Amino acid sequence: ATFPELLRPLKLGRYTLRNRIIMAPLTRCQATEDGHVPRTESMLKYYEDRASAGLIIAEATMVQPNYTGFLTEPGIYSDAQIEEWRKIVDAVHKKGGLIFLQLIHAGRAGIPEKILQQPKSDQDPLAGRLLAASAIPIKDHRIPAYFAASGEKETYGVPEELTDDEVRNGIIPLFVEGAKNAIFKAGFDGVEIHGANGYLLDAFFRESSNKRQSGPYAGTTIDTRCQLIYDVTKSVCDAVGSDRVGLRISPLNGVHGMIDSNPEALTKHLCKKIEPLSLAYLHYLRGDMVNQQIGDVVAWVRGSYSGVKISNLRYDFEEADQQIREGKVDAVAFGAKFIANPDLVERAQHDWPLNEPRPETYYTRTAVGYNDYPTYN
């Protein structure tokens, strides 16, 4: 067998995966701009073609109405959304695959020209507002043209600092409802909490974006920075069962100028803090997409977390295989390689050559660079 450790089944929460080749969450922007409804026609084909994966983690999907970071990403808050997702999940299950939905709040990376143009009036006190841990806008980065309202690069806006009461009673229940919608109604096998990549939860977790001076979510200690990640995940687990809940973090990922001054101590503490939750897994970016911050995230997690360990970032089959054989990680999620290879698992199984990804077409909103990468045959 080509990569015996990587191709071996894995117990994950209440499931047994067929293999340890995980499909990473990948925003591809194939939902409607109006109601963030999945465009079933394309998304069903896309995911069903990739259902040989050990597990699919579906793309970041909104929990708060209209709070869009990506212009055309899907939501999981409305009945319309749930109905299209249910059809997508049924098709993966028909192929025998497993699918978790990633749940996101874009925080300070929300698109100002979309969010700020729903009127500021009640029925929803969170609507019409940019929200984050602190009033610290993303600096010296522009909203990419493929996410921007216009279709041309835009400036991130200045967010409002969430009150302790809005976090506990405004943000957390949206994740809970989003997760119940995902699992109980659309039939998802699980949900992944989006604690990474500069979004709401990561922004509370790392020092650079959390300067709150007081309360349970303060920026002033490692434990209080961990608390929003904790409280969201815990409330979700209570409603849906911990065996159907994953968490993603990226303690070294410098997107949007995110940085913590002690990522090793932060990560290790997070691990001990979420241990009693008995999650289905912890999924982490082992590094920086920019290649600047360094640290062996794999070893930090291995030393302080005893549940399922899913790593990610510039893996190939051989590295994944050998990190699993050495006991460093339990599974590996692949991003770009799944974009380019719907039959990635088959290619591992016969060591077949791999299609090359084309980043230039990652976000077309059409079939081009989305559903046109062929299987090997």
Ligand X SMILES: Cc1cc2nc3c(=O)[nH]c(=O)nc-3n(C[C@H](O)[C@H](O)[C@H](O)COP(=O)(O)O)c2cc1C
Minimum CB separation from ligand X for residue 131, in Å? 19
Measured from each CB, the residue nearest to ligand X is 335
Residue carrying structure tokens 């939501």: 75
With residue 199 as reference, give the H or E element that holds it. Answer: none
Instruction: Report the 10 Å Cβ neighbour count for 2.
Output: 14
Spatial distance between the Cα atoms of 226 and 280, rounded to a whole number of angstroms: 19
Per-residue tokens: 327? 């006991």
Minimum CB separation from ligand X for residue 109, in Å? 12
Q: Classify residue 70 by its DSSP letter.
A: S
Nearest to 53 by CA among 85, 93, 5: 93
Minimum CB separation from ligand X for residue 119, in Å? 29
For ligand X, the closer of residues 197 and 210 by Cβ is 197
Per the DSSP assignment, residues forming a β-bridge with 333 are: 22, 312
- Report whether 102 belongs to an annotated binding site: yes
- AA letter at 229: I
- Report whether 25 belongs to an annotated binding site: yes
For ligand X, the closer of residues 205 and 212 by Cβ is 205
- Report whether 253 belongs to an annotated binding site: no
CA 104 to chain centre: 7
- Report whether 291 belongs to an annotated binding site: no
For ligand X, the closer of residues 218 and 247 by Cβ is 247
For ligand X, the closer of residues 199 and 305 by Cβ is 199
Q: Is residue 199 annotated as part of the catalytic site, yes or no? A: yes
For ligand X, the closer of residues 307 and 369 by Cβ is 369
- Report whether 129 belongs to an annotated binding site: no
58 within 8 A of 102, measured Cβ to Cβ: yes
- Report whether 248 belongs to an annotated binding site: yes
Minimum CB separation from ligand X for residue 250, in Å? 8
Minimum CB separation from ligand X for residue 328, in Å? 17
Q: Determine the straight-line distance between the first and last CA of the chain, rounded to whole angstroms.
A: 20
Residue among 46, 77, 156, 199 flagged as catalytic: 199
Interacting residues toward ligand X by CB under 6 A:
24-27, 59-60, 102, 194, 196-197, 248, 285, 312-315, 334-336, 362
CA distances from 34 to 28, 40, 105 (A): 16, 15, 18
- Sequence-separated (6 or more) residues with CB below 8 Å from residue 290: 254, 255
Q: Which residues fall in the annotated binding site for FMN?
A: 25, 27, 60, 102, 248, 312, 314, 335-336
Question: What positions carry a catalytic annotation?
Answer: 199
Q: Which residues fall in the annotated binding site?
A: 25, 27, 60, 102, 248, 312, 314, 335-336
